[PDB]
């Protein structure tokens, strides 16, 4: 029913974001040097 | 403690909606296997 | 005693190396 | 004597032994009521 | 240098000895 | 009987095959991988190494690991409801208790996972080489995780599962062991980078050497997994390799075993020589040198360099790696180079 | 179709806990000392 | 290779009833888990010292388990003088 | 084949080949015994490892 | 150095300044080299695995393959059958093109990094630095297995070339 | 032809010549202790058991037969430090001749059953096919091992109708060989107590007598016969290898962690021993009850035995060694001659020092003195321009108490230096270095190397088992599978059972 | 009577130049080791 390109798409913005989250805490509060 | 239940609360409705969505789909399974 | 060990060994690969190629067993098909 | 430490090896064992035991009780019932034609 | 007086007799046994067994294979292949 | 009647659903055709390996690989490789995970993710090793080493804390990836209980324990086996830990979870964690719990349930998920390979294997109706191959990884567990902290005083010193704590483990066998110097490992190094060679070579070769077999500029649709004909050609690839480099394969299957053989021989050879450091038996000197150098403050090679470089990593990382020992240098004691 | 398999097990014993644990790091990239 | 039999994974994550359940089961999990860091629940089950927990106003001194069989009450001292 | 005095003693010895019992046979009472085996090696096991202490049974050179 | 022990100098060195284990290059080339090795034993074993018998025990199975035969001497269908069950079957490959290929592909794309990794330490581009990165409420540094392997650089660093320094900073 | 890989495999279906090349292998063995035993009676120093026992000679097969009883030699010397002892035939010399008789018996043995290969007796009564019944002769073999396994215990170790076996103080300073009554209780599991190796032999005896006359009169399950192959003659090969492995590891373990069948006095030590200073702790003990007696310092140190204090030394640490370092450690450090004494450490305040010692791992180690609390006082400083704790500054000076250099001290910084070098090493001594032409480099004992041996060779069985192992059970196609095999066998939900063709849905 | 479980033995000359290469380049390794 849902175009699979579609879920694909969706689920890989979700990793590039979850991803970047964990990026982003490298340079703020733990871990951060600071 | 208190936070057991704060933790397992949204997985605790997780699986009682998913149980209901596929319970008239689940039951069957086990009628054609019995 | 030690260095002549060494390059005896090493002079043995070289001259296998000419045997392994030139003189190998030939394949056929 | 039952030192604490031989209290430990006999909970182990029956710790194990329940382990095992429920996993064949499990597959063996499973074995049971899904045979292959 | 002061090395091992058995070092020379030593490698040259684990040469000679593995190698003469693999000659003497060949030897009596190729004359079959 | 109740027997054949499991046997027939342990072996049933499934997008995952189970089989009587199963009953043991599964859950102890589902264990030994969640133990890491869950280490990683929470439990520290502040009690026992005196490190951070979660994601909680702070860690990042490279930098996480499930650290060794710390070296009062001994070879202690550390069961949860061991005289240690004595039932409790929390303690357990802070003890190390994971560490053991990985190792050990991942030392009986590889013999589930070889069985697994033999089962298979058995059912499908082809040799079981690919099991045989499997010892040369397991051969590396056993003597790395088990086998050596065995040897030494405790599990402290056998590696930490993390890839920076990995990377402590290469780093200490070369300032305390010298483990380059060692000739099992050497050949070790060829088994691997042979292997990676072969097995680049031969891919190479075989795709530059493929048949036509379709009108597409991509071959990989001109394949059928049940055609009778090779796919590339060997007559070719074996005038080719004889030309450029001399020598050349005849024969596919002695290039195949031979493929099989180079990087598991490097494997057990590498084993061999663990066994060894776990008794302190290194291939740490060489005599005859080291009589030349303290007769001859002239006479230097690349040997008694390297040796100094050890010197110093033992020195500098001892008193933090080995917290245990209560080291304590004295700045003026610290061997040190001129300027740095 | 079945729907609930060995399959079905196999997934969901890494797929729930992972979701769970990504939440949790989630969780601890806000952590300030 | 054929198929084994099961349902193909294309399929059901192309469905609704599946996305209809999962829009929920895995969000909660995600959430759950949020709340188990959150709360502080993690420092606690697994022993992970809290950022102020490492060492007590005045101490460098690593507390380091000294011995083997009494390493339980050993860590339990150190938690103590906190 | 030759025959010898001694291999015509032995000769009862070597002539139940490929006998076997019917179905599984003492196969169960093997696999207790194979429990209790694998039990004791676990026993002696920790007390090397101290895992299991008892009284009257110091694990050291000191005895 | 063109040398033996000159080589393993190289290697400690070159770690004491660049820190090329935590440099994703480097652990890219591991991963090609020990990938490298694990399917060349993989390959081997599989394809030995499913040679189809045309010898008997006494003698090799190498002589069940003659130089230029047009037939395979394995039976891709079999090998495939296995170790698609090893794991499942999605995760093997019934290609002998497409698994060739990725047999070229892993061990060469990961040596290609770790070429890169050297020639872009080359112009001191170091590896993950996270010495002192753990930090507790007060200001403490809460030490991970990345600051012992600093310290272990430390070691390194300051007795490499002992008499080749005259100032505080390894810059050459 | 055959590979040279698989020449030996021609025994595989002739029972006689399989005979006749394990008779040989039997032969070479024991013709190796014969000439190991010889070799080793040609180069051992028996005139001190004390400061040059067997296991700093590079002595191996030597303590073995010390270990079960032989300790006396036909020179009329025993290891013990005795003489005018009459040993009778069974002396090292007579053992050795033992084996080496044995060792051509063997051989001539071999010749027989070789040329006399085709005997009536490995031949089946019915189809003429040679063959052997493994299961009967695993009871008769196994009934026999039993018989000796008691015979062994019962008689030999307890002193019964034998020499008992070698036994000693926890830390060796008073062993000999004596009769051991067996220990029946739970400190019988206890690896330090002899009296459980007399009771294991016993009881597991008794076990494998009831177990092979089992074996002998009920045959084996149909089932269990064709799962486990006992018709093929390579299970057993994989299962004894197995086995096999299964003991090298075990000893390896009790080789390196000590136990009763691994006494200190003719192994050596162990690196545990140094790791908790075992000897350092008895030693100070009985300092400390000397001094509470009211003897002088000098006094209470020089009634500790050398004995004693060699054992607290590194360079009898087994973990110490190296890899191609080969010899006795007499060829590292030199021949132990003199102890000299303890080494006594004390600033320019009177206050004593202590001189931290050198871990295993540390082929090289700093010199550093501590206080009784743990606190530097003074060291051996590497960068002098900023020293502030050498041994010039803080005024270090040694004493000895005890050995041949009691009651003397050194105030020469130079001289001081030195001892403290050699007191990272734990108690001093004067080696005789130039009889070997010593090197100064340490060398592991026979402990470290029996240890290395058998755990490399138990880990290369452990392949042995996999690769035996899998050559019984896919017997049927190690030349290869089957060269039309159905495709529909191996391609997924064809059948509801891998493998089974009847149960295709 | 001969005994039918002889068997000839071979070692064609591509296993000769492997086993001497791998002789002779273990010979190479080991043999700074047995100098010492
Ligand atoms: C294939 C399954 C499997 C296997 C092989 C192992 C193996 C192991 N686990 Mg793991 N484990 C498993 C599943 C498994 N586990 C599962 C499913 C879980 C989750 C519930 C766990 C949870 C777990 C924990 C929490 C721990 C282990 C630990 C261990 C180790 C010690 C086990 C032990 O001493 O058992 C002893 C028990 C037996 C050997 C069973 C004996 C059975 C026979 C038939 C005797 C029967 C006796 C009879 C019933 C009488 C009972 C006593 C009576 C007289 C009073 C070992 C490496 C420990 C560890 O790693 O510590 C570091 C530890 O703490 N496991
Ligand atoms: C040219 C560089 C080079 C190369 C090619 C090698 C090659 C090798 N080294 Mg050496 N080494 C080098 C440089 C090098 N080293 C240097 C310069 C040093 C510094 C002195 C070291 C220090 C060093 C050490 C300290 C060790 C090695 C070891 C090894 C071997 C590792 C084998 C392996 O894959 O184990 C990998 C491990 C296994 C195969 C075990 C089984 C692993 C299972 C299958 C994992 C399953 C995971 C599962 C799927 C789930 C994972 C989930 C997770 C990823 C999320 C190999 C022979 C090791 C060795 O000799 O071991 C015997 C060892 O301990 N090296
Ligand atoms: C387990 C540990 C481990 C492993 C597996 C590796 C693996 C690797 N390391 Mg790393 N490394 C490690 C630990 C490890 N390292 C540690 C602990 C340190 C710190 C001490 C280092 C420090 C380090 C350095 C400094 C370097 C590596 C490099 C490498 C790579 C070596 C292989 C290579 O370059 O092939 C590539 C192949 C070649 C170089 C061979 C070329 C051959 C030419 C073309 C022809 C030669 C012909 C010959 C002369 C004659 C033939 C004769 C014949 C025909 C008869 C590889 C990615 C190297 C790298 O990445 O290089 C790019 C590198 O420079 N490592
Ligand atoms: C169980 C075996 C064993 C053990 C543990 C010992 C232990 C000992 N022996 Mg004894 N010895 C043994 C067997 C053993 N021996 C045998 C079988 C013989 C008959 C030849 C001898 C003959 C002998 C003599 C003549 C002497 C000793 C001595 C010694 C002592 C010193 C040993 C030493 O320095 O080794 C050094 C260890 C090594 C050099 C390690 C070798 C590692 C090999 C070469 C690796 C091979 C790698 C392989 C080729 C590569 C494979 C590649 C792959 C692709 C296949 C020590 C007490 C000495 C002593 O002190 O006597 C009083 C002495 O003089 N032994
Ligand atoms: C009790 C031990 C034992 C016994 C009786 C056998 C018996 C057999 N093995 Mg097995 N095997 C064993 C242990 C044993 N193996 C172990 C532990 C391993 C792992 C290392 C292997 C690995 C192995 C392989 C890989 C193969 C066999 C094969 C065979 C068969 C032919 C062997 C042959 O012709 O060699 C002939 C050997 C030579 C002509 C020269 C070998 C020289 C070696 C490599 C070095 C020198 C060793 C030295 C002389 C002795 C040192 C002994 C000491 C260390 C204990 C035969 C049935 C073969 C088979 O299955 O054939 C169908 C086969 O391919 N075995
Ligand atoms: C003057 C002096 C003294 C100089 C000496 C200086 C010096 C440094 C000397 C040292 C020399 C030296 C080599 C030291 C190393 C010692 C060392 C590491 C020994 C280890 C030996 C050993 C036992 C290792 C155990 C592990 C092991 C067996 C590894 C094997 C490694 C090995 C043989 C790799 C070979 C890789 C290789 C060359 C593959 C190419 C083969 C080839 C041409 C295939 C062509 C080809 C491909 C196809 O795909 C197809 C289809 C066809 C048809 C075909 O043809
Ligand atoms: C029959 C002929 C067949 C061929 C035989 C060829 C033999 C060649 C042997 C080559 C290597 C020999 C050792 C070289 C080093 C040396 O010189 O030792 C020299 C030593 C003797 O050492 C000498 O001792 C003297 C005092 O007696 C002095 O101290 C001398 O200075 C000292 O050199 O020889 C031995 O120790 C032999 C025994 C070694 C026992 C090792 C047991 C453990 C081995 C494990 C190996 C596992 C490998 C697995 C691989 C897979
Ligand atoms: C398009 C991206 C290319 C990336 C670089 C090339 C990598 C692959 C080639 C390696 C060469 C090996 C030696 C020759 C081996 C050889 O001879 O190959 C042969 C193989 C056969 O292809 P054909 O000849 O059928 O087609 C070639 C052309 O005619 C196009 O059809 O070539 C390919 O498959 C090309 C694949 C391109 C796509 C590859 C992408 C792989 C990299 C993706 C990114 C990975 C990043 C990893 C980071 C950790
Ligand atoms: C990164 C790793 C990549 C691996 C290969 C990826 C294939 C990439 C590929 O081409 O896949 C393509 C394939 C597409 O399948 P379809 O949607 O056509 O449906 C077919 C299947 O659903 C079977 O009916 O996707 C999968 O099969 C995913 C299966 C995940 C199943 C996870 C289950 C895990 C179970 C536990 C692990 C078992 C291990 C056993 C030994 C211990
Ligand atoms: C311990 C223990 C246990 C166990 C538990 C468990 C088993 C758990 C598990 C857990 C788990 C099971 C978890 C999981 C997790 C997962 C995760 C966390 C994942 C992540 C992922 C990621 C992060 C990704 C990444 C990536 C990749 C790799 C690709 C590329 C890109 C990216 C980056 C995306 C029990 C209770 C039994 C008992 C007691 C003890
Ligand atoms: C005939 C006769 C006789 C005589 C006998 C004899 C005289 C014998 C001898 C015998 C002998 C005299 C034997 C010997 C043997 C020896 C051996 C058998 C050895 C071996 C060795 C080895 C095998 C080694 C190896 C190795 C190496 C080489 C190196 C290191 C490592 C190893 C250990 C591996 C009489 C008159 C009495 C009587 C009867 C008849
Ligand atoms: O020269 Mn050869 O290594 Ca390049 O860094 Mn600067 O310079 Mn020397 O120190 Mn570090
Ligand atoms: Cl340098
Ligand atoms: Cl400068
Ligand atoms: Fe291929």
Redesign the interface.
Known sequence: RIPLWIVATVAGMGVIVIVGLFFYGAYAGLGSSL | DWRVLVVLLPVLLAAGWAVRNILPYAVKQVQKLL | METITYVFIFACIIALFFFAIFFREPPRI | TITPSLKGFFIGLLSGAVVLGLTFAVLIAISQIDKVQ | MEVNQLGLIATALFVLVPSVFLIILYVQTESQ | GWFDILDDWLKRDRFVFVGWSGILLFPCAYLALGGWLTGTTFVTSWYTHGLASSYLEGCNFLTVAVSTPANSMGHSLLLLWGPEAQGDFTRWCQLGGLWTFIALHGAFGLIGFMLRQFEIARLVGVRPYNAIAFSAPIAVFVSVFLIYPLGQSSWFFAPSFGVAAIFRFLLFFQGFHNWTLNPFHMMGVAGVLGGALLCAIHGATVENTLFQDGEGASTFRAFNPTQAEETYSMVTANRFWSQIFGIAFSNKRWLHFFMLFVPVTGLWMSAIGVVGLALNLRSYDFISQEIRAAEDPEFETFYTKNLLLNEGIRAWMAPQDQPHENFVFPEEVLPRGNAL | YPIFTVRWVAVHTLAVPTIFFLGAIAAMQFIQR | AGTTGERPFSDIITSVRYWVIHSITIPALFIAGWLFVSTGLAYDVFGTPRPDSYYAQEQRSIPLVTDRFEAKQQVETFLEQL | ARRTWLGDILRPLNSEYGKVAPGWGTTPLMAVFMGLFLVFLLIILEIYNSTLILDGVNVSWKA | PLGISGTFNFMIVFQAEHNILMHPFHQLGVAGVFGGALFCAMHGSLVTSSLIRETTETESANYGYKFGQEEETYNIVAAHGYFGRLIFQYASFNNSRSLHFFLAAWPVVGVWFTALGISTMAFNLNGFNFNHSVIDAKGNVINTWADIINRANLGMEVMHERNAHNFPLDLA | ????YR?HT??I??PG?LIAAHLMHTALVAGWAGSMALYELATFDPSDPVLNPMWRQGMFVLPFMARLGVTGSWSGWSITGETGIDPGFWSFEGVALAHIVLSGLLFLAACWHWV??????????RTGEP???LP??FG?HLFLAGLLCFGFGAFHLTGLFGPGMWVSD??GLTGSVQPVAPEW???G?????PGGVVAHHIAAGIVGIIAGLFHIL????????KALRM?NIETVLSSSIAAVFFAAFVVA?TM???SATTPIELFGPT???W?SS?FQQEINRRVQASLASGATLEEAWSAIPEKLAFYDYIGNN?????????GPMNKGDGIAQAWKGHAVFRNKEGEELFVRRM??????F???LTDKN?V?KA??????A?????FEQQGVTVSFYGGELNGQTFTDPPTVKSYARKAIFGEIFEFDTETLNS?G?FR?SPR?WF??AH??FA??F??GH??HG?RT??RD???????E?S?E????????????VT?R? | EPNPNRQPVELNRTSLYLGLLLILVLALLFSSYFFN
Not at chain 11, 477 to 483: K, N, T
């Open positions: 032809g055959l590979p040279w020449v021609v025994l279906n002739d010549r006399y290969w085709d005997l009536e007796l490995f031949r089946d009564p063959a052997l019944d009967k002769m008769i926890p830390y209780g739970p400190d599991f206890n690896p330090y107590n009920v045959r084996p399950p149909q089932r269990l016969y018709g373990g390196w962690y000590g690196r545990y021993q790791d075992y087994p973990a110490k060694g190296g890899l191609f370092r080969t871990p295993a791992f540390f082929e090289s700093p010199v550093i743990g530097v060291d051996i400083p590497f960068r002098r900023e020293s502030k704790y050498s090197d480099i592991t470290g240890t290395f755990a490399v880990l290369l452990f392949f996999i690769w899998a059970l896919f196609v190690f030349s290869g599978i089957d060269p095999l495709p066998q191996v391609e997924w939900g064809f059948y509801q059972k891998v493998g089974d149960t849905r």
